[PDB]
Design a binder for this molecule. Structure first.
Ligand SMILES: [Mg+2]
Ligand SMILES: [Mg+2]
Ligand SMILES: [Mg+2]
Ligand SMILES: [Mg+2]
Ligand SMILES: [Mg+2]
Ligand SMILES: [Mg+2]
Ligand SMILES: [Mg+2]
Ligand SMILES: [Mg+2]
Ligand SMILES: [Mg+2]
Ligand SMILES: [Mg+2]
Ligand SMILES: [Mg+2]
Ligand SMILES: [Mg+2]
Ligand SMILES: [Mg+2]
Ligand SMILES: [Mg+2]
Ligand SMILES: [Mg+2]
Ligand SMILES: [Mg+2]
Ligand SMILES: [Mg+2]
Ligand SMILES: [Mg+2]
Ligand SMILES: [Mg+2]
Ligand SMILES: [Mg+2]
Ligand SMILES: [Mg+2]
Ligand SMILES: [Mg+2]
Ligand SMILES: [Mg+2]
Ligand SMILES: [Mg+2]
Ligand SMILES: [Mg+2]
Ligand SMILES: [Mg+2]
Ligand SMILES: [Mg+2]
Ligand SMILES: [Mg+2]
Ligand SMILES: [Mg+2]
Ligand SMILES: [Mg+2]
Ligand SMILES: [Mg+2]
Ligand SMILES: [Mg+2]
Ligand SMILES: [Mg+2]
Ligand SMILES: [Mg+2]
Ligand SMILES: [Mg+2]
Ligand SMILES: [Mg+2]
Ligand SMILES: [Mg+2]
Ligand SMILES: [Mg+2]
Ligand SMILES: [Mg+2]
Ligand SMILES: [Mg+2]
Ligand SMILES: [Mg+2]
Ligand SMILES: [Mg+2]
Ligand SMILES: [Mg+2]
Ligand SMILES: [Mg+2]
Ligand SMILES: [Mg+2]
Ligand SMILES: [Mg+2]
Ligand SMILES: [Mg+2]
Ligand SMILES: [Mg+2]
Ligand SMILES: [Mg+2]
Ligand SMILES: [Mg+2]
Ligand SMILES: [Mg+2]
Ligand SMILES: [Mg+2]
Ligand SMILES: [Mg+2]
Ligand SMILES: [Mg+2]
Ligand SMILES: [Mg+2]
Ligand SMILES: [Mg+2]
Ligand SMILES: [Mg+2]
Ligand SMILES: [Mg+2]
Ligand SMILES: [Mg+2]
Ligand SMILES: [Mg+2]
Ligand SMILES: [Mg+2]
Ligand SMILES: [Mg+2]
Ligand SMILES: [Mg+2]
Ligand SMILES: [Mg+2]
Ligand SMILES: [Mg+2]
Ligand SMILES: [Mg+2]
Ligand SMILES: [Mg+2]
Ligand SMILES: [Mg+2]
Ligand SMILES: [Mg+2]
Ligand SMILES: [Mg+2]
Ligand SMILES: [Mg+2]
Ligand SMILES: [Mg+2]
Ligand SMILES: [Mg+2]
Ligand SMILES: [Mg+2]
Ligand SMILES: [Mg+2]
Ligand SMILES: [Mg+2]
Ligand SMILES: [Mg+2]
Ligand SMILES: [Mg+2]
Ligand SMILES: [Mg+2]
Ligand SMILES: [Mg+2]
Ligand SMILES: [Mg+2]
Ligand SMILES: [Mg+2]
Ligand SMILES: [Mg+2]
Ligand SMILES: [Mg+2]
Ligand SMILES: [Zn+2]
Lengths: 124, 99, 99, 138, 208, 83
RNA sequence: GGCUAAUCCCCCAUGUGGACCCGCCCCUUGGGGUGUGUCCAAAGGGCUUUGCCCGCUUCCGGAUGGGCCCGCGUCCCAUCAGCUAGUUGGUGGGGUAAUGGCCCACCAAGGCGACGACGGGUAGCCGGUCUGAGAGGAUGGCCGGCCACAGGGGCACUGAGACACGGGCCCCACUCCUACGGGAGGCAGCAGUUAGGAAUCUUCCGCAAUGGGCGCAAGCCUGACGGAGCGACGCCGCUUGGAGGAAGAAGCCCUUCGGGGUGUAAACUCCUGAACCCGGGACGAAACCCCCGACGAGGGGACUGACGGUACCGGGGUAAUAGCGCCGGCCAACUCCGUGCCAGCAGCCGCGGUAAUACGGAGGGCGCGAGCGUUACCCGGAUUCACUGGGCGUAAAGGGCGUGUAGGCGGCCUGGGGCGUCCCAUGUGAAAGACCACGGCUCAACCGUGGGGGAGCGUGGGAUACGCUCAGGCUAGACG
RNA sequence: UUUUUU
RNA sequence: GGGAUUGAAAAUCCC
C-alpha cells in the first residue's frame, strides 16, 4: 500500500471473536441441566464421555463436560460452568466445575484436588 | 419529613408577586408612552416616559431587574420615543431627553 | 490572538455574506506525509465589497449568526477563478455516485 | 520524466558500484552536486566532475572500492555498503536537531538538507539545525 | 515465611557446597562429603545434558538459596538493580550483602545465615544504637551493627565471638570483638565476594 | 471567597498538610490555586513547617481568608510580624 | 375576618457617583472621557452608650468562581449517499448578564456532503493506567479536573447564582393512606433490605483533628471527613524455630537382593522466646477563647480525643499452622503397581485397545509458599493490519481492457515571497502519578520535601537547502 | 472396512 | 452380555 493509500484507507484492526459465549463475558455462569449423556468421541480416540445440556442464566443452552471419574449429576441438578474445550468432542466448549452446588467432588481423589473439587483428608 | 426549608418556598411566592407587579407596571407604562409618540403628542409622551424610567431603576433597586437589565429597558424605550416623535417632532417637554 | 485565516471566496449568493474556503497543510499523525485539508467558513461582508474568486484574510470575530463567527479582514489577491473552478468541479462530481 | 532525481542518482551509484564501474554519469543538477560534495568529502567516492554528454550536462561520479580479496570471490569489499533514500516524494521526512539519527552507531552518515545547507548528521548537529533527511550512507 | 526444612540436602541438588548449615558444612558431614550427587531415588543416575533453560534456573536457585530468601523478595530485589545506575549484575550482589540478616552472619555474630536470621528477629541486634528486628533491613554504609548489651551475656554470643578472636573479616567489614560492635564500611565488589555463582546467568534468566 | 487552609496529603495515621490557597467551595483535597507551604503535625522532621511568607502576604492583600488553624501556623512563620 | 413589630415593602429628599437618550473627543466591534437634559441611593442593632464593634447604601478597582465564542484533536459500519423549512442568510424586533435563527414577523434562496453530510451501532471525556524495545495497542474503577443526570417526560419561580438529588408545578408508570371525594412518597447520600448475579462490606465510633454553613462570639449543624469493623481482594513486612546430631533407626518406597532412597530429616542434647500474662503508656493539640498591649504586631496563660489503654517502651515467657500446582515435548522434575479404545487426561501436538515416565494411587522430585491453581478479560510474543515493520508468476492477493474526472506525484536555471520545514527566546503543559536525590514510619508497602524532563499549541525574532507559491528562462520528458 | 508403520 | 477372531476393535461364526 502506498503511503497515499494508507492515508486514504489505513490499516484495519482485527476483531477477535470470543471462543466462549458465557455472556456478560463472565468468568463462570450457573445453569440447570437438561440431560446427562455419554458421547462417542472424535476420530483417533474412543470412550464414553459424560456431558450435560445446560440452560444458563444468560439464556443459553449449551453442552458441558463433566470431569472426574464419577459424577452425581442428575436430570434436574444445577451446576456451574467453567469454560475450556474438550478437544476430542465437537461442540463442547465449556467444562463443569466439580465441587459446586449440586455436583459433588470426586470421591477418594488424592492427587489433584484443586481441580475436581475435593477436600483434604486426615491421616492417623 | 418536614424540613423547614419549606419556609423558603413560602417566601419564594411572596417575592414572585413583588417582582411580577413592578414588571407589569413597566410594560403597561412603556407602551403607553410609545402610543403617544406614535400619535404625535410630545408633552404627554415625555411626562409619562420619565415615570417609566423611574419605575425601571426602582425595580433595579431590588432583585427584579438588578443588572443592566434595567438599562436595557431604558435604552430601548428612550430610542423609540425620540424616533416615533420624529413624525412632526416638536419635542415639547424635553424633560427626559438631551438637547 | 483572534485566529486569522487566508482563503478564497467560493460563494457569492448570500446577502452580506461570502463563503471562504481555507486550505490547510499538515503532516499525517502516523503516516507522516503532508496532507491537504479544507474547511468552508461563513464570513461577514457588510458592504458586499468582496466578490467571487477574491483571496481574502479572515479574522475570528464576535458571533454574527449561527454558523458565522469570522469577518473579512482585507483582500490579499483579487480574482483568481481557478481556485473556485477546482471546488465547483468537485461539487459537480457528487452528482454521479448515487444510483 | 524522472520521478525522484535524487533516489535516481543514489541508485545510479548503487547500481554502478555492484558491477564495479570506474565511473558513472548522473544528469546534472545543483542539489545532486551538493550531495556528491558530501560523499567526496566523506571518502565514499574518489570524486566527481562535470561533463557534457551530447550537449547536456552530467556528473561523472568516480567510485572507490576496497582491495582485491583472497580465495573464491576475489571481488573487492565495497566502500558504499548501503545507500537508501529516506525522504521520498509523497512521504517527506523532516527532523529537528534532536530528531537526527546516529547512523551505524557513528560509522555511517545521514545526509541532511538544512536551512543552513546540505550537511552530514555530525555537521548538522554541531551547527545546531535540522531539516529534511535525504539518505543514509554507510 | 522462608524455606523451613532440610538444607544439607540442597547442598546436593545445586552440586556446590552450600554453607547454610553453618558449621558441619565444614566438618566432614556436610553430605557434600561422600554424597555429592543430588537427592532422590534418581540422584545416583547419570544426568542428561541440561537444557539452556535448565542451567539458568539452577544458577538462580543456587544464588537465591544461599541467602535464604523467597522468590518474592528476591525478584523485587533484582528488578531494583536493572533500574539503578551501574552493572545490574554486581549491584544485585551488593544489595543482598546489605541485608541485616546477612551482615550479622558475615560479621561472625552467627554461625549460619539461618541463625543470623533468628538473631535479628528476636531483637539481639543493635543498628546505630537502635534495635532492629527485621532481617530485610538494608544496611547503609557507615551503620554500626552492635549486639544488644541485654544479650551480650548470653552464652551463644560469647560462643561465636570466642571463635571470632583472630579471624579476619571482609574488606568491606570490620568489627570489635569485646564490645561486640561492628561496622559496614562500604558495599562489596564482584572480586570481594567468593560466591560460586555466575551472575550473568541469572541476569539472562530474567530476560525471559 | 478565596481562603487559605490546609489540605490533607499524608496517609492513614500519618498526616501531612499542604498550606494552600483555594476557593472555599472546592473540596478540601481538591484542586487549589497555589501551594504556599507544608505542615507536619507529628513534627517528625527537623523542618516540619515552611511558608514563603512574602507569597503568603500577597494573598492577604487581595483578601484570602485563613482558617483558625492556618492562621496559627502563618503567625509562627511571622507573616504578620511588622517591626 | 381582625390587631401588630422589624435589617420586610413603599413615597419624598440629598447626587461623591452611576444608569439612559443625543452631541463632541480619544480609542477602535457595545473600550475610555465629556456636556446638557431625565432617572436612581440607604437599616438598623450591640455594648465596656461620646465612642468603638457587627452591619446598611451608590460607585471605581482587586481577587476568585463562571457564561458564551473560536482553531485544532476525539470509536465502528458505505450492506447508511445524498441531508436540510428555522433550514442558510438579511433587515427589524423580542429575550438574556451577554453575542447568536435563541425565539418571532417580513425579505432574499440559500446552507451542508466522498476531506464521509444524513442515518445506524457503540460510548461520559481527560490527567492517567496496563502493556510493549519502542512506535503502538488496550483502558478511563479508586484518587484529581470537566461534563451529564436525580423513577420517566416537560416547565418555570425564588435568587448573585438552579431550571435546582434530600425546593415548587403538571403529565405518565409504580408503592402506601383513603370516610373513594382526595392525598403522601422518590437512598444514582451513609449504613442496611430485597431482586438479579460467578461476585462486592458495618442498620459501627467520633466533632478530638482537617474542611464547610450560619454566628460579634459562646456555640450549633456536618453519614464531607477522620477512625474502627468485616473480605488473603491487592501490595508490603513477619512467624511456623536456631545450633549440635548415624557411612546413617523404625515405617513407607525401589532393588541386579549386595544394596539403594526419604536423609541431618525425625528422635535426642543445648540456646533463643511468635502467641499470651503484668505494669507504664503516646504523638497527632494548638488555636478559636481569657488576661496584658489599642479587640493590631508581639507576649502570656487556660480548656480541648474518636482512634484507645491501641501504637510503643520495659518485665515475664511457651518449640510453637503448611499448603497448592506440576513431573511425554514446549518446560525444572521418574520409578513401582493398578487399569487394557475401558475408566479417564488434554492449553496445542497427543497419551490409553497388557511392560503407559501422559490415565489413577503410592514413593520420589521440581516450583512457589499464606498462599497455590483455575476460568474470564487486556497487552505481549504477533514483523499475524507491517509508520518504525509484510506482501500479490506457481503459496492468501494485479482489477478482463481502455479512455479519462477528482485526488496523489513533478526535469533543468534564476529571482521574490517564507506556507510546510528547521533554529533562538518566551508563555503554557494544575496537583497527584512516572523518574533521580534525600528524609519520616525499627525495614519495606505507604507517605513527605526538593530536583529534572515532556510531545503539543500561543507569541516574538531568525535561517532559505528541500517541499509549496508567484514572476521569468531553458530543451534532455511529453506533443507536433 | 477402522485405529497403530513399528 | 461370555468363546472363535485379530496387536486390539468392527464385521462374521459358536452356546
Ligand atoms: Mg479512516
Ligand atoms: Mg457478542
Ligand atoms: Mg453480549
Ligand atoms: Mg479444541
Ligand atoms: Mg430559615
Ligand atoms: Mg395591561
Ligand atoms: Mg431573575
Ligand atoms: Mg452577495
Ligand atoms: Mg474590519
Ligand atoms: Mg440518479
Ligand atoms: Mg522512514
Ligand atoms: Mg551550538
Ligand atoms: Mg542497570
Ligand atoms: Mg541517563
Ligand atoms: Mg569496600
Ligand atoms: Mg482516603
Ligand atoms: Mg466550585
Ligand atoms: Mg520551624
Ligand atoms: Mg503584614
Ligand atoms: Mg387579612
Ligand atoms: Mg457630577
Ligand atoms: Mg430620588
Ligand atoms: Mg431593604
Ligand atoms: Mg476571568
Ligand atoms: Mg466498536
Ligand atoms: Mg427536521
Ligand atoms: Mg418545503
Ligand atoms: Mg420545523
Ligand atoms: Mg420536519
Ligand atoms: Mg439582534
Ligand atoms: Mg438569569
Ligand atoms: Mg441584542
Ligand atoms: Mg472537511
Ligand atoms: Mg444513536
Ligand atoms: Mg445504548
Ligand atoms: Mg452509554
Ligand atoms: Mg515500561
Ligand atoms: Mg479512549
Ligand atoms: Mg426527571
Ligand atoms: Mg421530549
Ligand atoms: Mg442569595
Ligand atoms: Mg437553557
Ligand atoms: Mg441541573
Ligand atoms: Mg433522597
Ligand atoms: Mg436541595
Ligand atoms: Mg407535594
Ligand atoms: Mg440471589
Ligand atoms: Mg472545623
Ligand atoms: Mg461577647
Ligand atoms: Mg442532627
Ligand atoms: Mg471514611
Ligand atoms: Mg507475603
Ligand atoms: Mg535442623
Ligand atoms: Mg527458657
Ligand atoms: Mg502538644
Ligand atoms: Mg483592656
Ligand atoms: Mg498572639
Ligand atoms: Mg472547640
Ligand atoms: Mg515485650
Ligand atoms: Mg518443633
Ligand atoms: Mg524435561
Ligand atoms: Mg492431570
Ligand atoms: Mg497388569
Ligand atoms: Mg502395567
Ligand atoms: Mg502418572
Ligand atoms: Mg491468583
Ligand atoms: Mg493473546
Ligand atoms: Mg504489532
Ligand atoms: Mg513488536
Ligand atoms: Mg510498511
Ligand atoms: Mg506476508
Ligand atoms: Mg491482466
Ligand atoms: Mg492513460
Ligand atoms: Mg490532474
Ligand atoms: Mg521541482
Ligand atoms: Mg502541485
Ligand atoms: Mg528563493
Ligand atoms: Mg515560517
Ligand atoms: Mg516550548
Ligand atoms: Mg506533573
Ligand atoms: Mg528510613
Ligand atoms: Mg514531586
Ligand atoms: Mg513563529
Ligand atoms: Mg514556466
Ligand atoms: Zn551442607
Amino acid at each position: 500500500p502506498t503511503i497515499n493509500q494508507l492515508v486514504r484507507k489505513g490499516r484495519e484492526k482485527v476483531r477477535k471473536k470470543s471462543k466462549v459465549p458465557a455472556l456478560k463475558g463472565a468468568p463462570f455462569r450457573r445453569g440447570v441441566c437438561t440431560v446427562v449423556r455419554t458421547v462417542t468421541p472424535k476420530k483417533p480416540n474412543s470412550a464414553l464421555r459424560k456431558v450435560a445440556k445446560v440452560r444458563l442464566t444468560s439464556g443459553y443452552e449449551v453442552t458441558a463436560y463433566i470431569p472426574g471419574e464419577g459424577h452425581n449429576l442428575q436430570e434436574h441438578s444445577v451446576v456451574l460452568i467453567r469454560g475450556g474445550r474438550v478437544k476430542d468432542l465437537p461442540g463442547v466448549r465449556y467444562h463443569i466445575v466439580r465441587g459446586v452446588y449440586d455436583a459433588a467432588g470426586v470421591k477418594d481423589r488424592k492427587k489433584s484436588r484443586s481441580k475436581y473439587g475435593t477436600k483434604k483428608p486426615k491421616e492417623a | 419529613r418536614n424540613l423547614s426549608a419549606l419556609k423558603r418556598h413560602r417566601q419564594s411566592l411572596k417575592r414572585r408577586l413583588r417582582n411580577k407587579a413592578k414588571k407589569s407596571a413597566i410594560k403597561t407604562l412603556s407602551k403607553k408612552a410609545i402610543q403617544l409618540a406614535q400619535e404625535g403628542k410630545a408633552e404627554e409622551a415625555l411626562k409619562i416616559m420619565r415615570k417609566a424610567e423611574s419605575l425601571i431603576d426602582k425595580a433595579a433597586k431590588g432583585s427584579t431587574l438588578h443588572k443592566n437589565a434595567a438599562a436595557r429597558r431604558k435604552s430601548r424605550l428612550m430610542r423609540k420615543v425620540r424616533q416615533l416623535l420624529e413624525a412632526a417632532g416638536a419635542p415639547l417637554i424635553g424633560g427626559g431627553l438631551s438637547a | 490572538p483572534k485566529k486569522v485565516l487566508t482563503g478564497v471566496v467560493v460563494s457569492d449568493k448570500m446577502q452580506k455574506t461570502v463563503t471562504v474556503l481555507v486550505e490547510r497543510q499538515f503532516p499525517h499523525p502516523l503516516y507522516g506525509k503532508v496532507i491537504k485539508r479544507s474547511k468552508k467558513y461563513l464570513a461577514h461582508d457588510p458592504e458586499e465589497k468582496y466578490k467571487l474568486g477574491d483571496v481574502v484574510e479572515i479574522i475570528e470575530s464576535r458571533p454574527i449568526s449561527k454558523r458565522k463567527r469570522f469577518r473579512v479582514l482585507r483582500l490579499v489577491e483579487s480574482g483568481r477563478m481557478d481556485l473556485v473552478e477546482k471546488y465547483l468541479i468537485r461539487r459537480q462530481n457528487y452528482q454521479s455516485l448515487s444510483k | 520524466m524522472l520521478t525522484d532525481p535524487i533516489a535516481d542518482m543514489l541508485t545510479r551509484i548503487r547500481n554502478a558500484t555492484r558491477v564495479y564501474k570506474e565511473s558513472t554519469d548522473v544528469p546534472a543538477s545543483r542539489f545532486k552536486e551538493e550531495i556528491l560534495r558530501i560523499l567526496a568529502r566523506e571518502g565514499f567516492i574518489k570524486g566527481y566532475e562535470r561533463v557534457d554528454v551530447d550537449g547536456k550536462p552530467y556528473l561523472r561520479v568516480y567510485l572507490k572500492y576496497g582491495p582485491r580479496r583472497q580465495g573464491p570471490d576475489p571481488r573487492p569489499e565495497q566502500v558504499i555498503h548501503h545507500i537508501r533514500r529516506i525522504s521520498k516524494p509523497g512521504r517527506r521526512v523532516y527532523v529537528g536537531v534532536k530528531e537526527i539519527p546516529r547512523v551505524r552507531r557513528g560509522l555511517g552518515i545521514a545526509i541532511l538538507s538544512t536551512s543552513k545547507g546540505v550537511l552530514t548528521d555530525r555537521e548538522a548537529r554541531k551547527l545546531g539545525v535540522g531539516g529534511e533527511l535525504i539518505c543514509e550512507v554507510w | 515465611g522462608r524455606y523451613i526444612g532440610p538444607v544439607c540436602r540442597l547442598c546436593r541438588r545445586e552440586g556446590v557446597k552450600l554453607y547454610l548449615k553453618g558449621e558441619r558444612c565444614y566438618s566432614p558431614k556436610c553430605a557434600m562429603e561422600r554424597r555429592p550427587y543430588p537427592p532422590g531415588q534418581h540422584g545416583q543416575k547419570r544426568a542428561r545434558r541440561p537444557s539452556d533453560y535448565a542451567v539458568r534456573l539452577r544458577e538462580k536457585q543456587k544464588l537465591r538459596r544461599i541467602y535464604g530468601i523467597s522468590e518474592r523478595q528476591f525478584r523485587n530485589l533484582f528488578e531494583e538493580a536493572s533500574k539503578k545506575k551501574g552493572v545490574t549484575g554486581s549491584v544485585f550482589l551488593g544489595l543482598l550483602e546489605s541485608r541485616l540478616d546477612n551482615v550479622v552472619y558475615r560479621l561472625g555474630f552467627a554461625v549460619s545465615r539461618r541463625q543470623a536470621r533468628q538473631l535479628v528477629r528476636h531483637g539481639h541486634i543493635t543498628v546505630n544504637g537502635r534495635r532492629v528486628d527485621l532481617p530485610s533491613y538494608r544496611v547503609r554504609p557507615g551503620d554500626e551493627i552492635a549486639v544488644a548489651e541485654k544479650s551480650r551475656n548470653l552464652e551463644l554470643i560469647r560462643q561465636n565471638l570466642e571463635a571470632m578472636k583472630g579471624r579476619k573479616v571482609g574488606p568491606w567489614l570490620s568489627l570489635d570483638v569485646e564490645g561486640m560492635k561492628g561496622k559496614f564500611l562500604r558495599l562489596p565488589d564482584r572480586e570481594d565476594l567468593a560466591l560460586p555463582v555466575n551472575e550473568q546467568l541469572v541476569i539472562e534468566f530474567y530476560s525471559r | 471567597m478565596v481562603k487559605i487552609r490546609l489540605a490533607r496529603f499524608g496517609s492513614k495515621h500519618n498526616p501531612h498538610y499542604r498550606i494552600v490557597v483555594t476557593d472555599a467551595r472546592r473540596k478540601r483535597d481538591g484542586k487549589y490555586i497555589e501551594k504556599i507551604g507544608y505542615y507536619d503535625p507529628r513534627k517528625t522532621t527537623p523542618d516540619w513547617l515552611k511558608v514563603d511568607v512574602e507569597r503568603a502576604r500577597y494573598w492577604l492583600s487581595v483578601g484570602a481568608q485563613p482558617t483558625d488553624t492556618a492562621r496559627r501556623l502563618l503567625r509562627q512563620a511571622g507573616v504578620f510580624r511588622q517591626e
